[PDB]
Write a protein that binds this ligand. Structure first.
Ligand SMILES: CCNc1cc(F)cc2c1NC(=O)[C@@]2(C)N1CCC[C@@H](Nc2ccc(C(=O)O)c(Cl)c2)C1
Ligand SMILES: CCNc1cc(F)cc2c1NC(=O)[C@@]2(C)N1CCC[C@@H](Nc2ccc(C(=O)O)c(Cl)c2)C1
Ligand SMILES: CC(C)c1ccc(COc2ccc(CC(=O)NCCN)cc2Cl)cc1
Ligand SMILES: CC(C)c1ccc(COc2ccc(CC(=O)NCCN)cc2Cl)cc1
Lengths: 352, 352
């Protein structure tokens, strides 16, 4: 790898807690600049080195080379600011402009890597070992991308424009986000199917049973996960009940405990056999040539990465012949909500 | 390893479907004898070779050596019949007697390996890498033991004594077994706690909605799994509701689909954080010096092996502050219900 990738890849990424993001709210902007002009090169270089561990028959394909060419240019864009003066307000403005260009440059990274998966499937095959390696790589690659976008969004949202702090809501009303995502999925379901399940929500605030459940979170991530789950639940409910006059509703429970905030969504959409659950989270099995449901795009496994990004999880358990439950597990406390970042080391090197 | 272990370990175990067990019901007894005088040495030798891949600081401990001494004697007991005449009815009688001695000889294998786990925890420590290796080894070791006991039970039950075929019920009414296990857990809960949750059962027979759900299964395995889950659900319900006059009931759904038969048990016993679920399935973290609940003995992870033994699973998902669901996944068809057997090869050798 080039000199500059070698230098920054020997650092490991520095994970931030939701509280640190929040405690960071003038002097703030210079502080963000000097943090990000080091940290973004570290995160970019670490994933670029990991891309380089893919075999030549993957590495040399047009999709991987185009993604590499983007990351290289973004890394160079940022390295221009290493010697610049944080007191000069023109430097801070150019920095923000450059981060916006970088975010736009990477907007197509998800489907671009999909074309690499697709080419591999049809030029080398879709066996379980290939599936495992694609799953290991893309989980880490997409999680790294999520963490880079988070950093950039927090800077450009705060230092271009406070109940919200960039993309973080310190008082995120969870049931309200549930309702929004449900309404939007319903609108798509009503349009395609003239029929959509109703919604039942129940809250369990264990410590304060009469208090509405709020948390510190990134509500756009939470909306995306819920919307993806609602689309699948409604589709399954409509198609499994062609003969009923009744569509069963979708039920959601929001539970707040001492450590977890959990959201369980329940459909009666007929379920799938246990054997197929792993297929639904697999990038490789969900990949085909160009409203993508579970098993036919990356919405579900990327939704799980959003949950894992701050130490949560997203799990599915179905009952074939009846329905399916999904649980989003989130950390309840902002000090436990810490970025989960892949690192390039000899422990990651060995998996390949 | 000795000559005789080397020979039989180069065969791999031959897994049987539930239908094959069943289709095997005089001439049957000679057929069982000549099958088992080869297959039991194969299964015994394969696991003995795998025990020998443990490091010397595990291998040399008194617990592992005692288990090895048992398996060695059982392997020798069986090898006596290799040259004998299946037509001689005295040989068949001695064979059954010898299998009964072997089953009794191994009755204490589970807690004996526990003492080896306990010694290791306190003489070398309880780090995650040690936990992973103990989990990999004991899952395979205990599953192998379950498959050996199954084979022996089918022979001694059929050819010493038909709605039932040995330990298999071709018409196992699942809700009835659920009720039995619930009644027994309730009796223990009523005794310790003067109070026990009631039971609600619902069935969903997707193809034939009015028909009671039956399957081909080993009902003693199913009873054990349910009883273990009910004990935990009741304990959690009693302890989390010290202040309520009401104990919430435990709900069970039995779903029959085209491929899966699924049993979901639901409590409102307050739940646990997601972080602790893995602790509950871990042998190492559940091990302590001599009614063991999840996290304090091997009932739960061994219950999961019973489900996996015929291509099923047992999964837990909790909601901290509310309750916990458990799902037993079984194969609905007797031709899909095939023994899951560990094998000694270079692929198993590498994990160590
Ligand atoms: C409470 C939230 N509910 C759910 C959430 C999910 F993320 C997934 C599902 C849910 N509810 C379902 O029923 C489920 C499982 N489906 C939704 C409709 C599409 C469907 N996809 C399939 C189905 C079958 C196959 C196959 O191999 O035959 C294949 Cl490739 C793909 C998945
Ligand atoms: C529908 C079936 N229900 C359930 C099934 C389970 F197999 C487990 C549970 C269930 N329902 C619970 O609540 C659960 C999770 N408990 C039951 C009571 C005992 C309890 N054990 C513990 C708890 C906390 C810790 C700790 O680290 O603090 C530890 Cl070591 C151990 C587990
Ligand atoms: C396009 C991206 C998402 C993508 C597409 C395809 C792949 C496939 O990656 C594989 C496939 C097989 C093996 C085993 C092997 O034989 N290794 C040989 C090592 N030289 C290793 C890897 Cl990393 C990964 C990532
Ligand atoms: C008693 C039984 C259940 C038991 C108790 C304890 C253990 C612990 O087994 C370990 C622990 C560490 C390592 C890594 C290592 O450093 N390996 C060195 C290889 N020479 C490998 C193994 Cl197989 C297994 C089984």
């Amino acid at each position: 790898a080039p000199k500059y990738i070698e230098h920054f890849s020997k650092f490991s990424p520095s994970p931030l807690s939701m509280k640190q993001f929040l405690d960071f709210g003038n002097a703030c902007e210079k502080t963000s600049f000097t943090f990000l002009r080091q940290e973004l090169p570290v995160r970019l270089a670490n994933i670029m080195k990991e891309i380089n561990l893919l075999p030549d028959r993957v590495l040399s394909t047009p999709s991987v080379q185009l993604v590499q060419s983007w990351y290289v240019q973004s890394l160079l864009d940022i390295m221009e600011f290493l010697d610049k003066d944080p007191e000069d307000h023109r430097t801070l403005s150019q920095f923000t402009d450059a981060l916006v260009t970088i975010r736009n440059r990477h907007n197509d990274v998800v489907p671009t890597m999909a074309q690499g998966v697709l080419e591999y499937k049809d030029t080398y095959g879709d066996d379980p070992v290939s599936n495992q390696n694609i799953q290991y790589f893309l989980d880490r690659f997409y999680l790294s991308r999520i963490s880079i976008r988070m950093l950039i969004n927090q800077h450009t949202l705060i230092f271009d424009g406070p109940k919200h702090i960039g993309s973080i809501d310190p008082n995120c009303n969870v049931s309200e986000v549930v309702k929004d995502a449900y309404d939007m999925a319903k609108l798509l379901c009503d349009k395609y199917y003239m029929a959509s399940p109703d919604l039942e929500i129940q809250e369990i605030n264990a410590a304060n049973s009469k208090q509405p459940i709020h948390m510190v979170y990134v509500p756009s991530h939470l909306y995306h996960m819920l919307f993806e789950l609602f689309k699948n639940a409604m589709r399954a409910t409509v198609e499994s009940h062609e003969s009923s006059l009744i569509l069963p509703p979708i039920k959601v429970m929001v539970a707040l405990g001492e450590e977890d905030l959990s959201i369980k969504m329940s459909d009666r959409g007929g379920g799938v056999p246990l054997r197929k659950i792993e297929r639904l989270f697999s990038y490789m099995y969900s990949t085909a040539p160009t409203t993508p449901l579970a098993g036919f795009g990356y919405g579900l496994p990327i939704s799980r990465l959003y949950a894992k990004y701050f130490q949560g999880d997203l799990q599915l358990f179905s009952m074939e012949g009846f329905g399916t439950d999904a649980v989003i597990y989130l950390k309840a406390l902002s000090t436990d909500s810490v970025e989960r970042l892949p690192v390039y080391n000899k422990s990651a090197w060995r998996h390949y």
